[PDB]
Coordinates of C-alpha atoms and ligand atoms in Angstrom, one line a residue:
Chain A
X1 CA 0.0 0.0 0.0
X2 CA 1.1 3.6 -0.3
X3 CA -0.7 5.1 2.7
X4 CA 2.0 6.9 4.7
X5 CA 0.9 6.6 8.4
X6 CA 0.0 9.9 10.0
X7 CA 3.0 11.8 11.4
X8 CA 5.7 10.7 8.9
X9 CA 5.2 13.5 6.4
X10 CA 6.7 16.9 7.5
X11 CA 4.8 19.8 6.0
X12 CA 7.1 22.7 5.3
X13 CA 6.3 25.8 3.1
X14 CA 3.2 26.6 1.2
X15 CA 4.2 26.5 -2.5
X16 CA 0.8 27.1 -4.1
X17 CA -2.4 25.3 -5.1
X18 CA -3.2 22.0 -7.0
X19 CA -6.2 20.2 -8.5
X20 CA -8.0 19.9 -5.1
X21 CA -5.7 21.4 -2.5
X22 CA -2.7 23.4 -1.4
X23 CA 0.8 22.3 -2.4
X24 CA 3.6 22.5 0.2
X25 CA 7.2 21.4 0.1
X26 CA 7.7 18.6 2.6
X27 CA 10.0 16.0 4.1
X28 CA 9.2 12.2 3.7
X29 CA 12.2 10.0 3.1
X30 CA 13.6 13.2 1.6
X31 CA 12.2 16.3 -0.1
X32 CA 8.7 15.7 -1.5
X33 CA 5.8 17.7 -2.8
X34 CA 2.6 17.5 -0.6
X35 CA -0.8 18.3 -2.0
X36 CA -3.2 18.7 1.0
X37 CA -6.9 19.3 1.3
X38 CA -7.0 21.7 4.3
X39 CA -10.7 21.1 5.3
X40 CA -11.2 19.5 8.7
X41 CA -14.1 17.3 7.6
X42 CA -13.5 16.2 3.9
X43 CA -16.8 16.4 1.9
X44 CA -17.8 13.1 0.4
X45 CA -17.1 14.6 -3.1
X46 CA -13.7 15.9 -1.9
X47 CA -12.8 12.4 -0.6
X48 CA -14.0 11.0 -3.9
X49 CA -11.4 13.1 -5.9
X50 CA -8.6 12.1 -3.5
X51 CA -9.4 8.4 -4.2
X52 CA -9.7 8.9 -7.9
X53 CA -6.5 10.9 -8.3
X54 CA -4.6 8.4 -6.1
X55 CA -6.1 5.5 -8.0
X56 CA -5.0 7.2 -11.2
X57 CA -1.5 8.0 -9.7
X58 CA -0.9 4.4 -8.5
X59 CA -1.0 3.4 -12.2
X60 CA 1.9 5.7 -13.3
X61 CA 5.6 4.8 -13.3
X62 CA 7.4 6.9 -15.9
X63 CA 10.4 9.3 -16.1
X64 CA 8.1 12.0 -17.4
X65 CA 5.3 11.7 -14.9
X66 CA 5.6 13.2 -11.4
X67 CA 6.5 10.2 -9.2
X68 CA 3.6 9.5 -6.8
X69 CA 5.2 8.3 -3.6
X70 CA 2.2 7.8 -1.4
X71 CA -0.9 9.3 0.3
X72 CA -2.1 10.3 3.7
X73 CA -5.6 10.4 5.2
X74 CA -5.0 11.8 8.7
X75 CA -4.7 14.5 10.0
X76 CA -5.8 15.6 6.5
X77 CA -5.9 14.2 3.0
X78 CA -2.6 14.5 1.2
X79 CA -0.8 13.3 -1.9
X80 CA 3.0 13.0 -1.8
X81 CA 5.2 13.0 -4.8
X82 CA 8.8 13.7 -5.4
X83 CA 10.1 17.2 -5.2
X84 CA 11.2 19.0 -8.4
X85 CA 13.9 21.5 -8.1
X86 CA 13.2 24.4 -10.5
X87 CA 9.7 25.5 -11.4
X88 CA 6.8 24.8 -13.7
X89 CA 7.0 25.4 -17.5
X90 CA 4.5 28.3 -17.0
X91 CA 6.9 29.8 -14.6
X92 CA 10.0 29.5 -16.8
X93 CA 8.2 30.8 -19.9
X94 CA 5.9 33.5 -18.6
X95 CA 7.1 34.6 -15.1
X96 CA 10.9 34.5 -15.1
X97 CA 11.3 34.6 -18.9
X98 CA 13.9 31.8 -19.1
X99 CA 15.3 31.8 -22.6
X100 CA 15.8 28.2 -23.6
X101 CA 17.8 27.2 -26.7
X102 CA 15.7 25.7 -29.4
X103 CA 17.2 22.2 -29.1
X104 CA 16.3 22.4 -25.4
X105 CA 12.7 23.5 -26.4
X106 CA 12.3 20.5 -28.6
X107 CA 13.7 18.3 -25.7
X108 CA 11.1 19.7 -23.3
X109 CA 8.4 19.1 -26.0
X110 CA 9.6 15.5 -26.8
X111 CA 9.6 14.6 -23.1
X112 CA 6.1 16.0 -22.6
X113 CA 4.9 13.9 -25.4
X114 CA 6.9 10.9 -24.0
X115 CA 4.9 11.3 -20.8
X116 CA 1.6 11.9 -22.4
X117 CA 2.0 8.9 -24.7
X118 CA 2.6 6.9 -21.6
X119 CA -0.6 8.2 -20.1
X120 CA -2.7 7.5 -23.2
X121 CA -1.4 4.0 -23.7
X122 CA -2.7 3.6 -20.1
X123 CA -6.2 5.1 -21.0
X124 CA -5.5 8.1 -18.8
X125 CA -6.8 11.5 -19.9
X126 CA -5.1 14.3 -18.1
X127 CA -8.0 16.8 -18.8
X128 CA -5.9 19.7 -17.5
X129 CA -2.5 19.7 -19.3
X130 CA -1.0 23.2 -19.1
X131 CA 2.5 24.7 -18.6
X132 CA 1.6 25.2 -14.9
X133 CA 1.4 21.3 -14.7
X134 CA 4.7 20.5 -16.5
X135 CA 7.6 20.7 -14.0
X136 CA 11.2 20.6 -15.2
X137 CA 13.4 18.9 -12.5
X138 CA 17.0 20.1 -12.4
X139 CA 16.0 22.1 -15.4
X140 CA 16.5 18.9 -17.4
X141 CA 13.7 16.2 -16.9
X142 CA 10.1 17.0 -17.7
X143 CA 7.5 15.5 -15.2
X144 CA 3.7 16.1 -15.6
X145 CA 1.5 16.4 -12.5
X146 CA -1.9 17.4 -11.0
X147 CA -3.9 14.3 -12.0
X148 CA -7.1 15.3 -10.1
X149 CA -9.0 16.6 -13.1
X150 CA -7.6 13.4 -14.8
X151 CA -9.6 10.3 -15.3
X152 CA -9.7 6.8 -16.9
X153 CA -12.2 5.7 -19.6
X154 CA -10.6 24.2 -14.7
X155 CA -9.8 27.9 -15.3
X156 CA -7.2 26.5 -17.7
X157 CA -9.0 28.2 -20.5
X158 CA -6.1 28.6 -23.0
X159 CA -5.3 24.9 -23.2
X160 CA -8.9 23.8 -23.7
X161 CA -9.8 22.3 -27.1
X162 CA -12.7 24.1 -28.7
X163 CA -15.1 21.2 -28.1
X164 CA -14.2 21.4 -24.4
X165 CA -14.7 25.1 -24.3
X166 CA -18.1 24.6 -26.0
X167 CA -19.0 21.8 -23.5
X168 CA -21.9 21.1 -25.8
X169 CA -20.9 17.4 -26.0
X170 CA -20.7 14.4 -23.7
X171 CA -17.3 14.2 -22.0
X172 CA -15.9 16.7 -24.6
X173 CA -12.6 15.2 -23.2
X174 CA -10.6 12.9 -25.4
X175 CA -7.0 11.9 -26.1
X176 CA -7.3 14.8 -28.5
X177 CA -8.5 17.3 -25.9
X178 CA -5.1 16.4 -24.3
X179 CA -3.5 16.7 -27.7
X180 CA -4.8 20.2 -28.2
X181 CA -3.6 21.2 -24.7
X182 CA -0.2 19.8 -25.6
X183 CA -0.3 21.8 -28.9
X184 CA -1.0 24.9 -26.9
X185 CA 2.0 24.0 -24.7
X186 CA 4.0 23.8 -27.9
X187 CA 2.8 27.3 -28.8
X188 CA 4.1 28.6 -25.4
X189 CA 7.5 26.8 -25.9
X190 CA 8.1 28.1 -29.5
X191 CA 6.5 31.5 -28.9
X192 CA 7.8 32.3 -25.4
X193 CA 4.4 33.7 -24.6
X194 CA 0.7 32.9 -24.0
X195 CA -1.9 32.6 -26.7
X196 CA -4.2 35.5 -27.5
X197 CA -2.0 38.1 -25.8
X198 CA -3.6 40.9 -27.8
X199 CA -7.1 40.2 -26.2
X200 CA -7.6 41.3 -22.6
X201 CA -11.1 39.8 -22.2
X202 CA -11.3 36.2 -20.9
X203 CA -14.9 35.8 -21.9
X204 CA -14.2 36.9 -25.4
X205 CA -11.3 34.5 -25.8
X206 CA -13.6 31.7 -24.5
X207 CA -16.4 32.4 -26.9
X208 CA -14.3 32.8 -30.1
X209 CA -12.1 29.8 -29.4
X210 CA -15.3 27.8 -28.8
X211 CA -17.0 29.0 -32.0
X212 CA -13.8 28.6 -33.9
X213 CA -13.4 32.3 -34.6
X214 CA -10.1 32.4 -32.8
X215 CA -6.9 30.3 -33.2
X216 CA -3.2 30.7 -31.9
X217 CA -1.1 32.9 -34.3
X218 CA 1.5 30.3 -35.2
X219 CA 3.2 33.1 -37.2
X220 CA 4.9 34.0 -33.8
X221 CA 7.1 30.8 -33.7
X222 CA 10.8 31.8 -33.4
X223 CA 12.7 31.8 -36.7
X224 CA 14.7 28.8 -35.4
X225 CA 11.4 26.8 -34.9
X226 CA 11.7 23.8 -37.3
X227 CA 8.9 24.2 -39.9
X228 CA 8.0 20.6 -39.3
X229 CA 7.5 21.7 -35.8
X230 CA 5.1 24.5 -36.8
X231 CA 3.2 21.9 -38.9
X232 CA 3.0 19.5 -36.0
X233 CA 1.7 22.3 -33.8
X234 CA -1.0 23.0 -36.4
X235 CA -1.9 19.3 -36.5
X236 CA -2.4 19.3 -32.7
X237 CA -4.2 22.7 -32.6
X238 CA -6.8 21.6 -35.2
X239 CA -10.3 22.9 -34.2
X240 CA -11.8 19.5 -35.2
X241 CA -11.1 16.7 -32.6
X242 CA -10.7 13.9 -35.2
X243 CA -8.2 15.9 -37.3
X244 CA -5.7 15.9 -34.5
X245 CA -2.8 13.4 -34.0
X246 CA -2.4 10.9 -31.2
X247 CA 0.7 10.8 -29.0
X248 CA 2.5 7.9 -30.6
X249 CA 2.5 9.8 -33.9
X250 CA 3.4 13.1 -32.2
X251 CA 6.3 11.3 -30.5
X252 CA 7.5 9.8 -33.7
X253 CA 7.3 13.2 -35.3
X254 CA 9.3 15.1 -32.7
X255 CA 12.0 12.5 -32.5
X256 CA 12.5 12.8 -36.3
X257 CA 12.6 16.6 -35.9
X258 CA 15.4 15.9 -33.4
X259 CA 17.5 13.7 -35.8
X260 CA 18.1 16.9 -37.8
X261 CA 18.8 20.3 -36.1
Chain B
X1 CA -1.3 -4.0 -12.7
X2 CA 2.3 -3.9 -14.0
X3 CA 2.3 -6.7 -16.5
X4 CA 3.3 -5.3 -19.9
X5 CA 1.6 -7.1 -22.7
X6 CA 3.7 -9.2 -25.1
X7 CA 5.4 -7.4 -27.9
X8 CA 5.4 -3.8 -26.5
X9 CA 9.1 -3.8 -25.3
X10 CA 11.7 -3.3 -28.1
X11 CA 15.0 -4.9 -27.0
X12 CA 18.0 -2.9 -28.2
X13 CA 21.7 -3.2 -27.4
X14 CA 23.3 -5.6 -24.7
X15 CA 24.5 -3.2 -22.1
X16 CA 25.9 -5.7 -19.6
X17 CA 25.1 -8.3 -16.9
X18 CA 22.5 -8.0 -14.1
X19 CA 22.2 -10.1 -11.0
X20 CA 20.0 -12.8 -12.4
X21 CA 20.0 -11.8 -16.0
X22 CA 21.4 -9.7 -18.9
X23 CA 20.8 -5.9 -19.2
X24 CA 19.8 -4.2 -22.4
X25 CA 18.8 -0.7 -23.4
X26 CA 15.3 -0.8 -24.8
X27 CA 12.2 1.1 -25.7
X28 CA 8.8 1.2 -23.9
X29 CA 7.1 4.6 -23.7
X30 CA 10.7 5.9 -24.1
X31 CA 14.2 4.7 -23.4
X32 CA 14.1 2.0 -20.7
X33 CA 16.6 -0.4 -19.1
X34 CA 15.6 -4.0 -19.5
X35 CA 17.0 -6.9 -17.5
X36 CA 16.2 -10.2 -19.3
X37 CA 16.8 -13.8 -18.2
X38 CA 18.3 -15.2 -21.4
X39 CA 17.1 -18.8 -21.0
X40 CA 14.7 -20.8 -23.1
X41 CA 13.2 -22.9 -20.3
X42 CA 13.1 -20.9 -17.1
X43 CA 13.7 -23.2 -14.1
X44 CA 11.5 -22.6 -11.0
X45 CA 14.5 -21.1 -9.1
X46 CA 14.7 -18.3 -11.7
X47 CA 10.9 -18.0 -11.8
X48 CA 11.1 -17.6 -8.1
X49 CA 14.0 -15.0 -8.3
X50 CA 11.8 -13.1 -10.8
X51 CA 8.6 -13.2 -8.8
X52 CA 10.6 -12.1 -5.7
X53 CA 12.3 -9.1 -7.4
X54 CA 9.0 -8.0 -9.1
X55 CA 7.3 -8.2 -5.7
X56 CA 10.0 -6.0 -4.1
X57 CA 10.2 -3.4 -6.9
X58 CA 6.4 -2.9 -7.0
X59 CA 6.8 -1.5 -3.5
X60 CA 9.4 1.1 -4.5
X61 CA 8.6 4.6 -5.6
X62 CA 11.5 6.9 -4.6
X63 CA 13.7 9.3 -6.6
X64 CA 16.8 7.5 -5.4
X65 CA 15.5 4.0 -6.1
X66 CA 15.7 3.0 -9.8
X67 CA 12.2 3.5 -11.2
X68 CA 10.4 0.2 -11.8
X69 CA 8.2 0.6 -14.9
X70 CA 7.0 -3.0 -15.4
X71 CA 7.6 -6.7 -16.1
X72 CA 7.0 -9.0 -19.0
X73 CA 6.7 -12.8 -19.1
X74 CA 6.8 -13.2 -22.9
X75 CA 9.1 -13.4 -25.0
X76 CA 11.2 -13.8 -21.9
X77 CA 11.1 -12.9 -18.2
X78 CA 12.1 -9.3 -17.9
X79 CA 12.2 -6.3 -15.6
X80 CA 11.8 -2.8 -17.2
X81 CA 13.1 0.4 -15.5
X82 CA 13.8 3.9 -16.5
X83 CA 17.0 4.5 -18.5
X84 CA 19.8 6.2 -16.7
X85 CA 22.0 8.3 -19.0
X86 CA 25.4 8.2 -17.4
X87 CA 26.9 5.2 -15.8
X88 CA 27.3 3.3 -12.5
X89 CA 29.2 4.9 -9.7
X90 CA 31.7 2.1 -10.1
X91 CA 32.3 3.1 -13.7
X92 CA 32.9 6.8 -12.6
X93 CA 35.2 6.0 -9.8
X94 CA 37.3 3.1 -11.1
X95 CA 36.9 2.9 -14.9
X96 CA 36.8 6.6 -16.1
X97 CA 38.3 7.7 -12.7
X98 CA 35.9 10.7 -12.8
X99 CA 36.9 13.6 -10.5
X100 CA 33.8 14.6 -8.6
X101 CA 34.2 17.4 -6.0
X102 CA 33.7 16.7 -2.3
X103 CA 30.5 18.7 -2.3
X104 CA 29.3 16.3 -5.1
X105 CA 30.8 13.1 -3.4
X106 CA 28.9 14.1 -0.2
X107 CA 25.7 14.7 -2.2
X108 CA 26.1 11.3 -3.9
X109 CA 26.5 9.8 -0.5
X110 CA 23.4 11.7 0.9
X111 CA 21.3 10.4 -2.0
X112 CA 22.4 6.8 -1.7
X113 CA 21.6 7.1 2.0
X114 CA 18.3 8.6 1.0
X115 CA 17.5 5.6 -1.2
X116 CA 18.8 3.2 1.5
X117 CA 16.6 4.8 4.2
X118 CA 13.6 4.5 1.9
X119 CA 14.0 0.8 1.4
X120 CA 14.9 -0.1 5.0
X121 CA 11.7 1.7 6.1
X122 CA 9.6 -0.6 3.8
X123 CA 11.5 -3.5 5.4
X124 CA 13.6 -4.0 2.3
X125 CA 17.2 -5.3 2.5
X126 CA 19.1 -4.7 -0.7
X127 CA 21.7 -7.4 0.0
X128 CA 23.9 -6.4 -2.9
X129 CA 24.6 -2.6 -2.5
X130 CA 27.7 -1.6 -4.4
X131 CA 28.9 1.1 -6.8
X132 CA 27.9 -1.2 -9.6
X133 CA 24.3 -0.9 -8.5
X134 CA 24.3 2.9 -8.0
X135 CA 23.6 4.7 -11.3
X136 CA 24.1 8.4 -11.9
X137 CA 21.0 9.7 -13.8
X138 CA 22.4 12.8 -15.6
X139 CA 25.4 12.7 -13.3
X140 CA 22.9 14.3 -10.8
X141 CA 20.5 11.9 -9.3
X142 CA 21.5 8.6 -7.6
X143 CA 19.3 5.7 -8.5
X144 CA 19.8 2.4 -6.7
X145 CA 19.1 -0.9 -8.6
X146 CA 19.5 -4.6 -9.1
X147 CA 17.0 -5.7 -6.4
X148 CA 17.5 -9.3 -7.5
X149 CA 19.3 -10.3 -4.4
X150 CA 17.0 -8.0 -2.3
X151 CA 14.4 -9.3 0.1
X152 CA 11.8 -8.0 2.5
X153 CA 12.4 -8.8 6.2
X154 CA 10.2 -11.7 7.5
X155 CA 26.9 -13.4 -4.6
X156 CA 30.4 -12.6 -6.1
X157 CA 30.6 -8.9 -5.1
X158 CA 32.9 -9.4 -2.2
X159 CA 34.3 -6.0 -1.4
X160 CA 30.9 -4.8 -0.2
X161 CA 30.3 -7.8 1.9
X162 CA 30.1 -7.4 5.7
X163 CA 32.2 -9.8 7.7
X164 CA 29.2 -11.7 9.1
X165 CA 27.8 -12.0 5.6
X166 CA 31.1 -13.5 4.4
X167 CA 31.1 -16.0 7.3
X168 CA 27.5 -17.2 6.7
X169 CA 27.7 -18.6 10.2
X170 CA 25.0 -16.6 11.8
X171 CA 21.2 -17.0 11.0
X172 CA 19.8 -14.2 8.7
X173 CA 23.5 -13.2 7.9
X174 CA 21.9 -10.2 6.1
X175 CA 20.3 -7.3 7.9
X176 CA 19.8 -3.5 7.8
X177 CA 23.4 -3.4 9.1
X178 CA 24.7 -5.6 6.3
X179 CA 23.6 -3.0 3.8
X180 CA 25.1 -0.3 6.1
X181 CA 28.4 -2.1 5.8
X182 CA 27.9 -2.2 2.0
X183 CA 27.1 1.5 2.2
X184 CA 30.3 2.0 4.3
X185 CA 32.3 0.5 1.5
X186 CA 30.6 2.7 -1.0
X187 CA 31.6 5.7 1.2
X188 CA 35.1 4.4 1.1
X189 CA 35.1 4.4 -2.7
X190 CA 33.7 7.9 -2.8
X191 CA 36.4 9.2 -0.3
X192 CA 39.4 7.4 -1.8
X193 CA 38.3 7.3 -5.5
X194 CA 39.5 3.7 -4.9
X195 CA 38.4 0.1 -4.3
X196 CA 39.1 -1.5 -0.9
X197 CA 42.0 -4.0 -0.5
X198 CA 43.4 -2.7 -3.8
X199 CA 46.8 -4.1 -2.9
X200 CA 45.6 -7.7 -2.6
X201 CA 45.1 -9.7 -5.8
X202 CA 43.6 -12.9 -4.4
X203 CA 39.8 -13.1 -4.0
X204 CA 39.8 -16.2 -1.8
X205 CA 42.3 -14.6 0.6
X206 CA 40.4 -11.3 0.9
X207 CA 37.2 -13.3 1.6
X208 CA 38.9 -15.4 4.3
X209 CA 40.6 -12.4 6.0
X210 CA 37.6 -10.1 6.0
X211 CA 35.8 -13.1 7.3
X212 CA 38.1 -13.7 10.3
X213 CA 38.7 -10.0 11.0
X214 CA 42.2 -10.1 9.8
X215 CA 41.5 -7.5 7.0
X216 CA 39.7 -4.2 6.9
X217 CA 39.6 -1.1 4.6
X218 CA 42.5 1.1 5.2
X219 CA 40.9 4.5 6.1
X220 CA 44.1 6.5 6.3
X221 CA 43.6 6.6 2.5
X222 CA 40.6 9.0 2.5
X223 CA 41.3 12.2 0.6
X224 CA 42.8 14.9 2.8
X225 CA 39.8 17.2 2.3
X226 CA 37.3 14.5 3.4
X227 CA 35.7 16.0 6.6
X228 CA 36.5 14.3 9.9
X229 CA 32.8 13.6 10.4
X230 CA 32.6 11.8 7.0
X231 CA 35.5 9.5 7.9
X232 CA 33.9 9.0 11.4
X233 CA 30.7 8.0 9.7
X234 CA 32.6 5.8 7.3
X235 CA 34.1 3.9 10.1
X236 CA 30.9 3.7 12.1
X237 CA 29.3 2.0 9.0
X238 CA 32.3 -0.3 8.7
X239 CA 32.5 -1.6 12.3
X240 CA 33.2 -5.4 12.3
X241 CA 30.5 -6.0 14.9
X242 CA 27.1 -5.8 13.2
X243 CA 25.2 -4.0 15.9
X244 CA 27.8 -1.3 16.5
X245 CA 27.0 0.1 13.0
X246 CA 24.4 2.9 12.6
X247 CA 21.1 2.7 10.7
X248 CA 20.3 5.0 7.9
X249 CA 18.2 7.5 9.9
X250 CA 21.3 8.3 11.9
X251 CA 23.5 8.1 8.8
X252 CA 21.3 10.5 6.8
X253 CA 21.2 13.1 9.5
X254 CA 25.0 13.0 10.0
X255 CA 25.6 13.6 6.2
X256 CA 22.9 16.3 6.2
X257 CA 24.8 18.1 9.0
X258 CA 28.2 17.6 7.2
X259 CA 26.4 19.4 4.3
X260 CA 25.3 22.4 6.3
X261 CA 29.0 22.8 7.2
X262 CA 30.1 22.8 3.5
Ligands
LIG301 O1 2.2 25.4 -10.0 C1 2.1 25.7 -8.6 C2 3.4 25.2 -7.9 N1 3.4 23.8 -7.8 C3 2.4 22.9 -7.7 C4 3.0 21.7 -7.6 C5 2.2 20.4 -7.4 C6 1.0 20.3 -8.1 C7 0.3 19.1 -8.0 C8 0.7 18.1 -7.2 C9 1.9 18.2 -6.5 C10 2.7 19.4 -6.6 C11 2.2 17.0 -5.6 C12 0.8 16.2 -5.7 C13 0.1 16.8 -6.9 N2 -0.9 16.2 -7.5 O2 -0.4 15.3 -8.5 C14 4.4 21.9 -7.6 C15 5.5 20.9 -7.5 C16 5.4 19.7 -8.1 C17 6.5 18.8 -8.0 N3 7.7 19.1 -7.4 C18 7.7 20.3 -6.8 C19 6.7 21.2 -6.9 N4 4.6 23.2 -7.7
LIG302 O1 26.0 -3.1 -14.1 C1 26.0 -3.3 -15.5 C2 25.5 -2.2 -16.3 N1 24.1 -1.9 -16.0 C3 23.2 -2.7 -15.4 C4 22.0 -2.0 -15.3 C5 20.8 -2.7 -14.7 C6 20.9 -3.5 -13.6 C7 19.8 -4.1 -13.1 C8 18.6 -3.9 -13.6 C9 18.4 -3.0 -14.7 C10 19.6 -2.4 -15.3 C11 17.0 -2.9 -15.1 C12 16.3 -4.0 -14.3 C13 17.3 -4.4 -13.2 N2 17.0 -5.1 -12.2 O2 16.4 -4.4 -11.2 C14 22.3 -0.8 -15.9 C15 21.4 0.4 -16.0 C16 20.4 0.7 -15.1 C17 19.6 1.8 -15.3 N3 19.7 2.6 -16.4 C18 20.7 2.3 -17.3 C19 21.5 1.2 -17.1 N4 23.5 -0.7 -16.3
LIG303 CL1 2.5 1.0 -7.7
LIG304 CL1 24.1 -8.4 9.0

């Protein structure tokens, strides 16, 4: 089992928030990340998420997926993963303006696909892939996290495929919803910025993207962005679910992109 | 469940030998290390070794334990882990005589203790700790592996073998403290860049002597910048008497203090 008996985890500093709780740095057999639900009496629903996420996380063992290390139910519900030195992709790209070399950008991308291919072969849909959820350990290895909105067969507007934004379908979530999210992550990597920067109105972005009036301006990729890469982005950011590639194909594509650079 | 269906693992190069098998680089959701038993008809002793090692690795999820990813039963019996770009600590210290800095050597020791602490807490005895089984993922992160010989409470790798393990006279010759002696030898390698008993060329004699207590690692050979507390820890972990050796909670703290003062 992976239940860490109450008292073993040492909760240090509050880092931020996760799918269904607050993230703190912690100590359990070393440095760990701790995602804790702070309520005293967990709501049945809340408890449900914990169980789901944990059940989802028990089925992951991959270099590019945040290593779930265990869980805790008392004093409070908590999810313990490894600790990633550095920050999330969102942070690197949009807060501290880390300027990565293009070959490093393609590496980050390939790794994210490596992890997402893993997830999909396992019938896991992340349902909330964003830069905020892609952590770069030792500014080298990409690990994906926050698997609470995940599931097995948001406020994250910018990564949401138009059929998800529309929400006018049944589980508008698909391996392609994830693929679109990933394609937006690709935009961020090769643009250095967030989609739709020239619009200041969240509602407006939401509507247009949902009705297909708005799309990421791929004309902003850096000059060094392999064209193949621009074309792959386009394939992933297609406004029609079935016109988008799955992760084995995306992986094969990026790896070829790598052979020549 | 961790069974990987037939056909999904792509076996690449032969990388070397494992405890009960042959290690290859491979591909399964990315670069993976694969250890395969290269036999046609697997005896029940090897099927037992396999079910044992799978059972232990399932319980390991720690940055300093080599990431188990899954097992296959066809084409062959196999264990699949993450792929560690770099090489074993042994390779670095004795093959390419890599020159890590003390700060790094201490960090490598901290991480190996971190990994060792994780296992011993889940009641796992590694039973074959050695530089050969410590891999340097990106020359940064220590990943401990080869849990073939490992077991859960209730070889030919002599230099890491505690005296009582060499003798095989006591019951349960192996114990948390056997792996602490193994760790003590790994500390030695880190602090001398060297193998113990490097001036003796007879395996049988080294076995006998360490077994009787005639022989022990020369500690005056630690590098002159090795902190006094790291040498003191090294010798605590290397005490001939099993129960006079620390456990990894004490060991980790010690190193973590050494750190603060460096
Ligand atoms: O983006 C906000 C900052 N931030 C949030 C997390 C985080 C998010 C989700 C989850 C965990 C940690 C652990 C449990 C979990 N759910 O999977 C991290 C983090 C992740 C890994 N190592 C270090 C830090 N940073
Ligand atoms: O020592 C000879 C060289 N060598 C052996 C391994 C090895 C050893 C044992 C086991 C595995 C791989 C995989 C399964 C296993 N048993 O747990 C490795 C290695 C480990 C991790 N990443 C890259 C290489 N190098
Ligand atoms: Cl597991
Ligand atoms: Cl012992």
